Structure 1
Amino acid sequence: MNTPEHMTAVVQRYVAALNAGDLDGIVALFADDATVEDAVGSEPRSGTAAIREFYANSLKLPLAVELTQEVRAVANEAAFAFTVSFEYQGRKTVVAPIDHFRFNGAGKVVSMRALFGEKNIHAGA
């Protein structure tokens, strides 16, 4: 089982790498055969290459990412509340999802999902 400290560390490493625009540091968190989802129902992206292309797209612009509460980490999973703020067709928008990571035994993330709706997408103005 992963430790909760490891899992919490990965989540912090994830948020810092988002903020740094460290594409390759994000991918490094994920297993070879991980699956990522932008949003509930979005096309799942599986495998290192689909994951790098996903994160490359996510990082097409500078992101301001803030962890807004403690990470919840238990068993082989973590969930976290956060905000992602960036220029969306030239206007600053702040999206507040809750993400869910599951981890494999090697401690790499095997799955990510970000849960958010329309009411979680905000001006910040």
Structure 2
Amino acid sequence: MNTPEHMTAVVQRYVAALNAGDLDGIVALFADDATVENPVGSEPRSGTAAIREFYANSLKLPLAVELTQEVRAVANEAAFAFTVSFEYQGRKTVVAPINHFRFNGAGKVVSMRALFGEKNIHAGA
């Protein structure tokens, strides 16, 4: 089933799910033995339980998430630029990563990696 059209749709779904705080729908996009490496450089989380815990932890504050450019999708991989916004104690932060998804034949994500650093975290005092 995996096509560039499918992978683009999955990226759009992943954004929508984060927006909604929908753990079931985020985790559903992943293969059972997938990895999540967030940020790049950290120990990968491996398999459904670990992936759900990771997203649960990321979702404790409501996130407003938005693609900021066209999805790049080719072969069996996709990359996307987006922002994740949240508020805590009256301060708004906007984080701007680039994520990479690798997909299996069935169109499930087998690996996510998220590149961002301190310069991509935008907050006032």
TM-score bracket for this pair, using the shorter chain length = over 0.9
Give CA-to-partner distance per residue, 1:102-123, whole Å, 9 cap, x none: 0011110000011012111112
Partner deviation per Cα, 1:38-83 (whole Å, 9 max, x = no partner): 1011221000110111111111110000100000000000000000
For normalisation by structure 1, the TM-score amounts to 0.94
Sequence identity percentage = 98
**Runs of 4+ deviating beyond 2 Å:** 87-91
Q: If the length of structure 2 is used for normalisation, what is the TM-score?
A: 0.94
What 5-or-longer segments of structure 1 have no aligned partner? none
> How many residue pairs align between the two structures?
125
Larger deviation, residues 13-22 vs 84-93: 84-93
CA separation in 2, counterparts of 1:123 and 1:9?
Answer: 30
Name stretches of at least 5 consecutive residues in structure 2 with no aligned partner: none
Change (3 A) 1:69 1:101: same
The alignment partner of 1:51 has SS state of helix
Q: CA separation in 2, counterparts of 1:4 and 1:53?
A: 29
Alpha-carbon RMSD: 1.6
Distance in 2 (CA, whole Å) between partners of 1:33 and 1:7 is 18
- 1: CA distance, partners of 2:2 / 2:23: 24
Please give the alpha-carbon distance, in whole angstroms, between the structure 1 residues aligned to 2:110 and 2:10.
Answer: 12
